[PDB]
Each structure stands twice: as structure tokens, then as C-alpha cells.
Structure 1
Amino acid sequence: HHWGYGKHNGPEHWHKDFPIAKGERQSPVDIDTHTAKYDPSLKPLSVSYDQATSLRILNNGHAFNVEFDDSQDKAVLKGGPLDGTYRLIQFHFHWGSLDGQGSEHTVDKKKYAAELHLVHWNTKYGDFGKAVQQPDGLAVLGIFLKVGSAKPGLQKVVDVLDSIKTKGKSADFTNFDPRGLLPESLDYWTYPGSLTTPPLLECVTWIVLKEPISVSSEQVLKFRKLNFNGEGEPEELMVDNWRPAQPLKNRQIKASFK
């Protein structure tokens, strides 16, 4: 009985195996744009993915991860609310069964069709495992997806999904440039939060971009053809793999713009 997104193992059940699910710094959250405040202390955000080295794509039973070689200082995120350098380790998405839902963070309660998470770990901690035990160990850059025009840079990911349809399947995925998934503007909101899936660790500095990228209906439809199940098991489409907004509690969301 593993955690998941169904009626009997979904978000409302996670707290039993992962008590921190009812913690003081859980993610995602609804971003109330009128309550968020411009923060002059934020430094310019720097996304440097020019030397990014992708290696593989994997269906892990809850989403698919495009993994990167993070043994060297390549794709890094710095600046903004961050102190130091954070290295890109993987990206994945959360999406819905319908275009009207799918994102984890919401903006004035608005839900987008999907949300991309580019996961980075603080290099002061040596590696990802050590980083996820620190309060400033990770930085996740979140980007909303809306359905409209296709995103050319996403097509390479879409086309390989046929080969990793079920849980446990992986496929070589080299030379993918994540710069092709970024919107024009880097305006963002930021707040201290957590991993949005078990173990739900509270080690993340969230940076959520205000401008969503557009993807076509055809592209998101292919995301929805993936399976939560393993090969040869009853088919459960991989849709609605998002956690709903959690209590903001004692936190303030800061904006990088006025």
C-alpha cells in the first residue's frame, strides 16, 4: 500500500506515513498576489543552463523525471532569494486529467493545466542526499503550463514518453536543453516550503515564475497517456498527480517585481 494519488493512498492519506505532511512549511500553497510583497532585498535571479547535461528520462510511478549529470558545476541557479549556488539534478511535471486542473501551486486560486519543477540542490552540502536534510538544501523553480500554442522545446520530451509508458521504465535522454522550457520573463514569487511528494521534506526555497509557458493540447494529451502502473498491470492513467494547496501558516510570499 504505497503512497499515490488515488482515493485510498492520495494526499489526504500521506500524513499517516509522513507526519510532516501537516507541518509548518508544506508545499504547494496558493499564491495570493495581493498579499505577496515586493522584496527589494532579492538579488537578480540567475538561471544558467547553457552547459546542462541531461542523461536519462524515467517513469517513477508518480511522474517522469528527466535526470541531469550533476557531478560538476553545469546547470546552476543562483541569485534571487538564494545564497550560493544550486545545481540542477532533474525536472518533472505535475498535470491534470483535464486542462482546468493539474498545477500544484495556484495563483489567486487559479489552477493551471500543469506545472514544471526544475529541482536543484545547494552545492555547499556536497550532494542531493545531504542537501535534503538542510533547511536551505534545495531550490525548485516552478513554471506553470497553460494550454494554447505548442512549446517547441518540449516536443523532444513528449516524443520519448511512448518508451517509458509504465512505472520503472527508463530511456536514454541526452542533449536535452532545458532553456527551451523557460518563459520570457523571470518575474517570480518565492517562499520557504517543502517537497510536494513524500517524504515531503521541508528543505525547499520555492521560486515560482509568474509567466506561464504555453503548451499545446496535443502535448499535454500525451502526458496523460502515461501509466502509474508497471508493465503488465491493470492500466491507471498517470493524471492528476498533483498535491492541493496547503496551509500557508507562518509564511510570507515575496515577489521579485512590483
Structure 2
Amino acid sequence: HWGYGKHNGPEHWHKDFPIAKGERQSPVDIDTHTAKYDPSLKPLSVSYDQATSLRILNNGHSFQVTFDDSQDKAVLKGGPLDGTYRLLQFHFHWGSLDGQGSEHTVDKKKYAAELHLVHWNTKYGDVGKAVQQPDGLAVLGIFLKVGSAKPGLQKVVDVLDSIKTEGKSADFTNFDPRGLLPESLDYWTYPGSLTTPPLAECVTWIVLKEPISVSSEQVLKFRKLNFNGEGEPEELMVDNWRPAQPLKNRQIKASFK
């Protein structure tokens, strides 16, 4: 029922999901001059060498690549986190044109897209339990700007024509998510929420300072996707981003000076 349009978009979500007006909603604008360098923050540990991708799916709001999360194979640790978080899926948010598409903003700047790698805390045993806890999820967010192609994204781009419409899926084995990461793991962090319904307040956000560059041809393929199902009136899957929400009583911390 929910979506990104005039009649079902972000301004409507609070009716079915009242937490939309909560105290720790995401995304937010990252004011770089107000974010506090925290020398107690540890380097982020990204251990993706044994990742096992399974499927790629158009879920009617984005496309996602899903992973086997039944053992510690692709895990996030360190940084602001206590314990171990397993990679479940990644997906993207993007715009109709290159000047919008990201969910987080940096000094009000919008990037062309944003990659979210979604992880859950192993101490809660499964993701459905983790989303009920304030420290249940860790989402690693990476900005995309348009420039040179990202080689590690091409395998994704080349299969999008097979999942054009909603609920369509394909095999997507042997994909290495290390190929989506920028050089630096410098980050901002704050406590927040899912940016899509149910908007649960369960996420430690880790947003990388360094964007990745993707080519115009790569992002053009994202924009050929459809929100609609097969045979239904065609509506391009574009502008699938929630705008920045009030920071309220939260501090954004920087891992770098």
C-alpha cells in the first residue's frame, strides 16, 4: 500500500506507521560542522570475504541482493558497534535526475543515490527479533555520485532487465559486495530507524564520508526499473527516497577529524 507517490508517499506513512513521527527517525541531514569527532570510536571492521549472495529481487520499492545470514560469513563489527552484525541484504535509493536520490544529506547536499548494506545483531538470533530492539540493526550507508563507472556494480546492472517489475527475482550467486566499497571507511554515526515502513527505531547508522562513483549508464539502468507489477500501468522506479527527518535529541559523531 505505501510507496513514494503523492497519495501514498512519505507524508502519508505516519497513518499506518505512527512511529514515523518518532524521536529517532532516519534519514537525517548530516551537518558536518556540528558532528563531533569522537576519538573513542573504533575503525569499522567489514569482513565480507566469505559472503554468500543468493538472489536479486524487485520488491516494488527498490531492488535488493540477499545473502545467506545463517552463519557469520559477511559481518560488520567495531566502529560504534558492540558485538557482531550479519549482512542480510543490500539495496539502493535513487532519483529521477542526478541532483537527488540519496536519503541522508551532507550539509544539505543530495547525492544521486545511496547504497544501504543491512546487517542484524547476532545476539537476537534472527532479523525479525532484531528489528524489535534499539540496537538490533546496523546499516552501512554509502553515497553514489555520477562520474566514472564502478566495476563492482556492473554485475548488478546487467541483470536489472530481468527483474523489471515487482516480485520478480533471479539467481544472484557469487556476488562480492567488497566491490561496492570506497577506499576510506571514515564515517558518521547516529541512532536512527529504518527509512521504509515499518520505520522501526532499531538502527545504528554508519554513513561513509567517501562516495563511490558510478557511471551515467549504470544509474540510467536503475531508472528503467518499474514500481509496478507486470502488465500494470508503467511507473518508473525513481525517487524512492525518504527525505531528511528531524534530528531531535541526537548527536551525530564522526570517526575522523
Give the TM-score range, shorter chain. over 0.9
1:159, CA displacement in angstroms? Answer: 0.3
- Alpha-carbon offset, residue 40 of structure 1: 1.5
Write the distance in 2 (CA, Å) between the matches of 1:200 and 1:142: 16
State the distance in 2 between where 1:85 and 1:187 align: 19
CA distance in 2, matches of 1:24, 1:119: 21
Q: Deviations over 1:199-236 (max 9, x none)?
A: 00000000000000000000000000000000010000
Distance 2:186 2:127 in 1: 27
CA displacement 1:51-77 (0-9 Å, x = unmatched): 000000000000001000011110000
CA displacement, residues 174-218 of structure 1 (integer Å, 9 cap, x when unaligned): 000000000000000000000000000000000000000000000
Shift of 1:88: 0.2
Q: Determine the C-alpha separation between the residues in 2 that align with 1:120 and 1:85.
A: 9
Show the counterpart of 2:226.
227
TM-score (norm 1): 0.99
The residue aligned with 1:141 is 140
8 A contact 2:66–2:90 mirrored in 1? yes
Q: Secondary structure at the match of 1:43?
A: coil
What is the CA-CA distance between 1:44 and the residue it aligns to? 1.6
Query: How far 1:118 moved relative to its partner?
Result: 0.1
- In angstroms, what is the RMSD of aligned CA positions? 0.3
Contact 2:43 2:185 in 1 (8 A): no
Counterpart-to-counterpart distance in 2, 1:204 and 1:250: 16
- 2:150/2:214 contact within 8 Å kept: yes
What does residue range 2-17 of structure 1 map to in structure 2 within 5 Å?
Answer: 2-17=1-16
Using the alignment, how far apart are the partners of 2:185 and 2:70 within structure 1? 26
Deviation string 1:76-107 (CA, Å, 9 cap, x unpaired) is 00000000000000000000000000000000
Task: Report deviation, 1:34.
Answer: 0.1
Identity of aligned residues (%): 97
Q: Could you tell me which residue of structure 2 aligns to residue 115 of structure 1?
A: 114
Long gaps (5+) in structure 1: none
Distance 2:28 2:171 in 1: 34
Question: What CA distance in whole angstroms lies between the structure 2 residues aligned with 1:242 and 1:96?
Answer: 8
Partner of 2:189: 190
1:41 shift after superposition = 1.5
Residue 247 of structure 1: SS of its match in structure 2?
A: coil
Aligned mates of 2:27, 2:111 — CA distance in 1: 13
Q: Structure 1: how far apart are the matches of 2:3 and 2:204? A: 24
Deviating 4+ runs (over 3 angstroms): none
Alpha-carbon distance between aligned partners in 2 of 1:70 and 1:191, rounded to the nearest angstrom: 24
Residues of 1 paired with 2:69 and 2:13: CA distance? Answer: 30
1:121 and 1:74 map into 2 onto residues whose CA distance is 13
C-alpha deviations, 1:8-34, integer Å up to 9, x for none? 000000000000000000000000000
Helix, strand or coil at the partner of 2:117: strand
CA–CA distance in 2 between the matches of 1:248 and 1:173? 37
Give the C-alpha shift of residue 42 in structure 1: 0.9
The Cα shift of 1:43 comes to 1.4
Q: Give me the TM-score of the superposition, normalised by structure 2.
A: 1.00
2:75–2:85 Cα contact (<8 Å) kept: yes
Question: 1:113 Cα deviation (Å)?
Answer: 0.1
Give the Cα separation in 2 of the matches to 1:12 and 1:194.
16
Other structure's SS at 1:201 match: coil
Structure 2 gaps, min length 5: none
Measured in 2, the distance between the counterparts of 1:127 and 1:13 equals 30
In structure 1, distance between residues paired with 2:32 and 2:124: 33
